[PDB]
Amino acid sequence: VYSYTEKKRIRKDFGKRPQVLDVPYLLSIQLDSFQKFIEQDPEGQYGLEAAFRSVFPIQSYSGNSELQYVSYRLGEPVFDVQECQIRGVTYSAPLRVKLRLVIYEREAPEGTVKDIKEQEVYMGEIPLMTDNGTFVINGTERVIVSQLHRSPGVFFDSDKGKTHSSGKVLYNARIIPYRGSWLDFEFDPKDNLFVRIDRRRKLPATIILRALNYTTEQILDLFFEKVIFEIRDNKLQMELVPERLRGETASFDIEANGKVYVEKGRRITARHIRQLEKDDVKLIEVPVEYIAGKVVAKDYIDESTGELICAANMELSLDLLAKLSQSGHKRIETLFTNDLDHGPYISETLRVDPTNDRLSALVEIYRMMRPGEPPTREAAESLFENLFFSEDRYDLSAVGRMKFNRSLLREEIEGSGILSKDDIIDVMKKLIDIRNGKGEVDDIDHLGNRRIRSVGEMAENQFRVGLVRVERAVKERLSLGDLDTLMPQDMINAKPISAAVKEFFGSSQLSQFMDQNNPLSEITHKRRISALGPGGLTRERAGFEVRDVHPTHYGRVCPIETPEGPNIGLINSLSVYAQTNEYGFLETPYRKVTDGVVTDEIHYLSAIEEGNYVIAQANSNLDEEGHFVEDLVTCRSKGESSLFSRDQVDYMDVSTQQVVSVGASLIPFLEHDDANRALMGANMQRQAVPTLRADKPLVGTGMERAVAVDSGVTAVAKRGGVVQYVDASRIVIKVNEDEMYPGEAGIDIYNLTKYTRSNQNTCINQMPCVSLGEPVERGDVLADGPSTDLGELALGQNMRVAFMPWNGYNFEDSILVSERVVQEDRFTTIHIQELACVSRDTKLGPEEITADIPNVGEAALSKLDESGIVYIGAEVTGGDILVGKVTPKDSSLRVPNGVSGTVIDVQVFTRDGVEKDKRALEIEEMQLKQAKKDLSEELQILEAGLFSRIRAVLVAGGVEAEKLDKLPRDRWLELGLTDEEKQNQLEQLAEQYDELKHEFEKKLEAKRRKITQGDDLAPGVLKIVKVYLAVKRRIQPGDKMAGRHGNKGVISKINPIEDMPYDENGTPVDIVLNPLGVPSRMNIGQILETHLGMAAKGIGDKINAMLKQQQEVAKLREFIQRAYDLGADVRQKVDLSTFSDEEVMRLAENLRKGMPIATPVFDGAKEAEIKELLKLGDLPTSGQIRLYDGRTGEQFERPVTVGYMYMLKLNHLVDDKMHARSTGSYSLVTQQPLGGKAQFGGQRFGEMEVWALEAYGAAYTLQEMLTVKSDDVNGRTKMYKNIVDGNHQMEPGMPESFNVLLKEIRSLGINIELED
């Protein structure tokens, strides 16, 4: 059940919940989105194919010809990854598309072909994606984070009464397309209805209604019920709808069927309607006074005169009734109006409308959209048409249509990408309906309304907006005549597309530099989910409602991991199990709960579908049958939590740890800390500098191996086999027999990247973790990268910590560090810096790098060879010469002050047309030799593998072991053999061997060509020389090392070992933290971790003692078994009886430094098992032992706490911060000292400090500090003279910056000057 390579170190595991869904690949959302971006998708709906088929074909205006698209293709990358990183050129791929120009015949009818021509036009360079998921742009590999932008569709939002100061809400409805112009409807405080387009001036909506060719009566018939009045012999017997009487009173006596149904002044009861319907009344005689305040429905005309008695949509008057009766209009249609059921919100807008016909409405729209430019008959209609209904300028995506139809209770989840009359009408209907009470506003933080937009989609859209320009250019080109000699090369230009894509990839707000000082930093940076960028919300003007955690975040976006400071809640990180839906929403997994059984089938649910069901959370006890042992089970029904019955549930979470991000899943005992302190813990875990030799963490959360192998650093095997020859640089695996293809036998070979700089100057290299003869299996780990150990993440070191105040040296948060921590050299970190030197081509001729420079003794030149470049391996120090350059008339590069280290690599590039000096030729020859030797070695490795395969297949059916060795290998592959498929295999292998020979003999030539060629370079440079320094930053008082629970601190002293507290056994502790920091900053996780680590190291020490004296396996087997036992029904169940009796010995060997312990975040080890484990060793169960002071030698009372804690050394050194300046450079426009450490700049005496100095009586110091120390040029020259001459004084003068202000303000018309 346990792999061989997994028996090196079995991590004792706590926890009780049986995992049911192992963590997925942690980089899916990148390697899959970009995978879909570039693929042959015949369905034509993903990636480039969609864009091409969307913009093409292109039809000319006449149109006598058109240009249509056929297919595309991606060429071979010019340079592989390593060369691109070395030189600084994008790891790109040419893009070749097979356009096709077709020419019709003018005289012949529309549709005919005179001749059609096509060719493969080049256009663009799309960067590719490395295996890990990081692009390389200019030797500065970057990563693109995903965006979280609000989805296209429709939203009925509202303002919470923050306008008009009347406490009256104002609902509004917005239609957001995926690409085009928006649309808004709003309610004025006077219950009007205003359209608004792209946030321009307001408009009454009725005009946009008329734009679709609608008449007044049409609108009214669309938006209202009609009450009918019947002019009869007796004053308007009226046809009544029963539902009207609901919620209204009677102004008269409703009496019909010879029965007084109700009198006036009485509110109408449901009983009244019930009796009316029982009597089945259809008509009621109504007094004429009721029609006093009504409004006609449709216009009514006089039959004889042909005139209009009363236009539609106007009130009624008694004389109007008289005219109606005179005209004999029997049926009169009027509006159905009420103050709560059917507000007449349309008629009022009609009245506000100053327009009546289609032309005038279109003209109004045209004038609003384009101020000035008097409209024409066609301009307005063309504007409207191509604004809102042309597929080329307005487009709801498929997601848009789906969301839209889901928000209007439709049935179809697919339709057109444009609007239509019914869409706008339905939106207006729904908005009015909301105003009347039915329906509900929609909040905006719902994760069912925000869409993840990964790298593929954004790049595709940038490519499309690139294509639009060339489309316009070619359309206007074809509009011209003279098409008899065109080709699809001159009209298509490669510059626009390349610019449009390159600018996005290289300089955007979402393609950012990838911090690379860990495996964890990379993994947690590729999963980032930003909300800023184009189309998102600005950093500094974002409200507060956005930053909070919505209840829908549970299981999709981690709630505790977020960069604090200026932007909280905008850079939230993705959760562990969260997937991306088909459209782009965020899904999370759940376990289907049938009638009463918790099954194992899992469904991925979206943010909206969760709001309906009932989900019982993860830690609900069940016993071997899916039956919930308890009967009142906790659940999250819909945006809230409760307790429900054992049968009402419908889903149960997957695992306890699907709520947290990957970054915060490594904290042990996470459930005990506070929230913000765990937040700081994670954000500081992301910055741990890799150390000199990594060490496993004694107390992990079992989520290490996944992060280690799912990042790219470790060299994970691909086909299990047997190690054939390991080495400090490469590895070779003979593949097992099963996992081998029929032909192309070969053997797997791995190359390991030795010391090469990361992006933060921390060296990354790989070390083998196997030896000869060791079997390995698919997916196993072979080469450990930076901060890894047998393939499990290990960022810092585990050290012995004691909690107690110590002579104030750990006063606030400081840390007292024993001297063993530096004597054993277990925190020193290696840094690699790159220093460049260029030979510009300037006036007075160019300058060179000759080894001779003026006025310097040979001593400083001892380290430069005859050419002028330092030797590889020289041990430079602060203030030295690396390359000697000359002032053309001394610009030699020099080591930055304060840094030490050794030069480990030199490179030189020379522009074509310049002869190459001696050193460059030497390096080129060295590289030639190295490449040839490497290729020869690998070739013979593969050849030996092939012949081993052949010998394997020959001995089957006709073995002559003696014969094979007699005739050498060179003549084996034609020996006789019986007739069967075996001969076929022999032929195939021989063919493979010849092919391999050819492959090598040409690849060598390719590498020679790549090396010996010239180098592209920027204009003006002749040659660039780069030198790499390696430094060992060891440790100083001032560094900043921190734990995993946000207990950062600045190391404060390095005590000699004889002064540190030591327990009665004699082992002095190695840290002394400050106990005062726990209670106020509630994080007990560190204390519990300390106790657990103490127990683990106790067990390790017992095993180490047992092995020191020779103890046979009889005892180690027993003890290790009993140790792996002693849980509270744990799920580990590791059985030692099955081990090979020598893997037991090796397991003991790897456990002698402590038994690793696991603790899933929210299902961890409680107190009782910690106590039991402690008692397994002979340690005191209380957890606190009695120490002894170092100096006095007397005992501390109050027994203190000592244990083992995992600590990281953060990347905030002291020697990158400490800085000083006395008299350096000076800015140009305003004479003030420069700023920053790069330049030798000085600090800033900010405004608030000036206030502070004024608060004292201090006046002289302030005056000098902003007159003679920074600005007044003559003042400071004389100050320097005086100081040198030992006579302290000053000559103030006037600041230069003030003169700058004076001139600048005088540059306007203002005349400002100084008076007498």
Partner 1 sequence: MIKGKQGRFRQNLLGKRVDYSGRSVITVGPYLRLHQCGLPKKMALELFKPFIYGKLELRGLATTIKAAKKMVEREEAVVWDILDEVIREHPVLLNRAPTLHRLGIQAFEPVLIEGKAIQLHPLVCAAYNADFDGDQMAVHVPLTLEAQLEARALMMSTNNILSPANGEPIIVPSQDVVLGLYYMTRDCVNAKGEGMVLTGPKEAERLYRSGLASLHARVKVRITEYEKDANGELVAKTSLKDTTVGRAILWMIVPKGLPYSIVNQALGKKAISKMLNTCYRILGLKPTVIFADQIMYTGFAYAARSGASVGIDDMVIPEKKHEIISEAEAEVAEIQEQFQSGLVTAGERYNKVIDIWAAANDRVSKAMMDNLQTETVINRDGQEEKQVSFNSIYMMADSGARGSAAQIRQLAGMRGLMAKPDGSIIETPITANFREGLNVLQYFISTHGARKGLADTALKTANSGYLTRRLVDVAQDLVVTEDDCGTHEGIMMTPVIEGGDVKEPLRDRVLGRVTAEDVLKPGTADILVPRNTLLHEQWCDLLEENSVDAVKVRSVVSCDTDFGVCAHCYGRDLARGHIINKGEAIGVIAAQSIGEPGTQLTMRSSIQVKNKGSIKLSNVKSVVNSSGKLVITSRNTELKLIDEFGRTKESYKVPYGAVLAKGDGEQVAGGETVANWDPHTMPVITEVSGFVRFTDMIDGQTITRQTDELTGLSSLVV
Partner RNA sequence: GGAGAGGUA
Site for partner 1 in 869-908 (CB under 8 A): 879, 898
The DSSP element (H or E) to which 98 belongs, if any, is strand 92-103
Select from 684, 731, 851, 1279 the one that contacts RNA (CB under 7 A).
Answer: 684
Q: Which residues contact 205 (CB under 8 A, 6 or more apart)?
A: 185, 193, 194, 195, 349, 428
Q: Which is nearer to RNA, 513 or 1280 (CB)?
A: 513
Burial class of 304 by CB neighbour count within 10 A (0 to 12, 13 to 18, 19+) = exposed
Select from 791, 945, 1242, 1275 the one that contacts partner 1 (CB under 8 A).
Answer: 1242
- For partner 1, the binding residues in 544-603 under the rule CB under 8 A are 544, 547-549, 554, 559-560, 562, 564-566, 568-569
**For the window 513-532, what string marks contact with RNA as x by the rule CB under 7 A?**
x-x--------------x-x
**Measured between alpha carbons, how far is 539 from 559 in angstroms, rounded to an integer?**
19
**For the window 418-457, what string marks contact with partner 1 as x by the rule CB under 8 A?**
----------------------------------------
Cβ proximity of 1228 and 1294 under 8 Å: no
| Token output for 200 | 């321009």
Cβ proximity of 527 and 557 under 8 Å: no
Mind spelling out the 3-state secondary structure of 679-745?
A: HHHHHHHCCECCCCCCCCCCEECCCHHHHHHHCCCCEECCCCEEEEEECCCEEEEEECCCCCCCCCC
Query: Minimum distance from CB of 1036 to partner 1 (Å)?
Result: 5
- For RNA, the binding residues in 566-585 under the rule CB under 7 A are 567, 571
Q: Which is nearer to RNA, 218 or 891 (CB)?
A: 891
Query: Minimum distance from CB of 243 to partner 1 (Å)?
Result: 29
Q: Is residue 89 a contact residue for partner 1 (CB under 8 A)?
A: no
Q: Is residue 804 a contact residue for partner 1 (CB under 8 A)?
A: yes
| DSSP β-ladder status, 254-256 and 511-513 | unpaired
Q: Of partner 1, RNA, none, which one sits near residue 1256, judging by CB under 5 to 8 A according to partner kind?
A: partner 1
- For RNA, the binding residues in 700-759 under the rule CB under 7 A are none
Q: Of RNA, partner 1, none, which one sits near residue 802, judging by CB under 5 to 8 A according to partner kind?
A: partner 1
# residues near partner 1 by CB under 8 A: 143
# residues near RNA by CB under 7 A: 21
Q: Of partner 1, RNA, none, which one sits near residue 1250, judging by CB under 5 to 8 A according to partner kind?
A: partner 1
Sheet strand arrangement including 450-453? 450-453, 146-150, 529-530
- For partner 1, the binding residues in 1262-1291 under the rule CB under 8 A are 1264-1266, 1268-1271, 1276, 1279-1280, 1283-1286, 1288-1290
**For the window 1048-1067, what string marks contact with RNA as x by the rule CB under 7 A?**
x-------------------
For residue 136, give the 3-state DSSP assignment. coil
Q: Which is nearer to partner 1, 293 or 1246 (CB)?
A: 1246
The DSSP element (H or E) to which 939 belongs, if any, is helix 918-955
Select from 803, 827, 1028, 1206 the one that contacts partner 1 (CB under 8 A).
Answer: 803
| Token output for 915 | 């002869």
Burial class of 377 by CB neighbour count within 10 A (0 to 12, 13 to 18, 19+) = exposed
Q: Which is nearer to partner 1, 186 or 673 (CB)?
A: 673
Q: Of partner 1, RNA, none, which one sits near residue 512, judging by CB under 5 to 8 A according to partner kind?
A: RNA
Mind spelling out the 3-state secondary structure of 1033-1085?
A: ECCCCCCEEECCCCCCEEEEEEECHHHCCECCCCCECCEEECCCHHHHCCCCH
Q: Is residue 565 a contact residue for RNA (CB under 7 A)?
A: yes
Residue with tokens 């595991």: 13
Q: Is residue 21 a contact residue for partner 1 (CB under 8 A)?
A: no
DSSP 8-state symbol, 1215:
T
Q: Of RNA, partner 1, none, which one sits near residue 509, judging by CB under 5 to 8 A according to partner kind?
A: RNA
Select from 53, 1115, 1244, 1306 the one that contacts partner 1 (CB under 8 A).
Answer: 1244
Q: Of RNA, partner 1, none, which one sits near residue 1253, judging by CB under 5 to 8 A according to partner kind?
A: partner 1
Q: Which is nearer to partner 1, 484 or 1197 (CB)?
A: 1197
Residue with tokens 């919470």: 160
764 DSSP β-pair partners: 756
**Measured between alpha carbons, how far is 53 from 51 in angstroms, rounded to an integer?**
6
Cβ proximity of 559 and 659 under 8 Å: yes
Using alpha carbons only, what angle is made at residue 1292 by residues 1290 and 1293, rounded to the nearest 5 degrees?
145
Cβ proximity of 518 and 795 under 8 Å: yes
Q: Which residues contact 636 (CB under 8 A, 6 or more apart)?
A: 554, 614, 615, 617
Using alpha carbons only, what angle is made at residue 1060 by residues 1059 and 1065, rounded to the nearest 5 degrees?
115
Select from 392, 433, 503, 564 the one that contacts RNA (CB under 7 A).
Answer: 564
Q: Of RNA, partner 1, none, which one sits near residue 1014, judging by CB under 5 to 8 A according to partner kind?
A: none
Q: Which is nearer to partner 1, 936 or 1225 (CB)?
A: 1225
Q: Of partner 1, RNA, none, which one sits near residue 814, judging by CB under 5 to 8 A according to partner kind?
A: partner 1
**Measured between alpha carbons, how far is 238 from 1191 in angstroms, rounded to an integer?**
109
Q: Of partner 1, RNA, none, which one sits near residue 811, judging by CB under 5 to 8 A according to partner kind?
A: partner 1
**CA 661, 664, 670, 676 torsion-angle sign:** negative
Residue with tokens 């170092």: 1190
Q: Of partner 1, RNA, none, which one sits near residue 1218, judging by CB under 5 to 8 A according to partner kind?
A: partner 1
Using alpha carbons only, what angle is made at residue 897 by residues 896 and 903, rounded to the nearest 5 degrees?
50
Q: Which is nearer to partner 1, 289 or 812 (CB)?
A: 812
Q: Of partner 1, RNA, none, which one sits near residue 596, judging by CB under 5 to 8 A according to partner kind?
A: none
Q: Which amino acid is at 956?
A: A
Select from 1234, 1253, 1262, 1300 the one that contacts RNA (CB under 7 A).
Answer: 1234
Listed ranges 233-241, 433-441, 481-489, 1256-1264: which one lies at the site for partner 1 (CB under 8 A): 1256-1264
**For the window 664-683, what string marks contact with RNA as x by the rule CB under 7 A?**
-------------------x
Q: Is residue 69 a contact residue for partner 1 (CB under 8 A)?
A: no
Select from 130, 237, 360, 512 the one that contacts RNA (CB under 7 A).
Answer: 512
Closest CA to 128 of 71, 81, 59, 195: 81
Q: Of RNA, partner 1, none, which one sits near residue 977, judging by CB under 5 to 8 A according to partner kind?
A: none
- For partner 1, the binding residues in 322-381 under the rule CB under 8 A are none
Cβ proximity of 365 and 384 under 8 Å: yes
Q: Of partner 1, RNA, none, which one sits near residue 846, judging by CB under 5 to 8 A according to partner kind?
A: none
Q: Is residue 1180 a contact residue for partner 1 (CB under 8 A)?
A: no
**For the window 259-298, what string marks contact with partner 1 as x by the rule CB under 8 A?**
----------------------------------------
Closest CA to 1065 of 1148, 1152, 1179: 1179
Q: Is residue 1184 a contact residue for partner 1 (CB under 8 A)?
A: yes
- For RNA, the binding residues in 1180-1219 under the rule CB under 7 A are 1212
| Token output for 87 | 């030189």
Phi and psi at 104, nearest 5°, equal -85, -170
DSSP string, 1001-1017: HHHHHHHHHHHHS----
- For RNA, the binding residues in 1256-1315 under the rule CB under 7 A are none
- For RNA, the binding residues in 232-261 under the rule CB under 7 A are none
**Measured between alpha carbons, how far is 70 from 498 in angstroms, rounded to an integer?**
21
Q: Is residue 202 a contact residue for RNA (CB under 7 A)?
A: no
Binding stretches for RNA (CB under 7 A):
509, 512-513, 515, 530, 532, 539, 563-565, 567, 571, 683-684, 687, 1048, 1212, 1227-1229, 1234
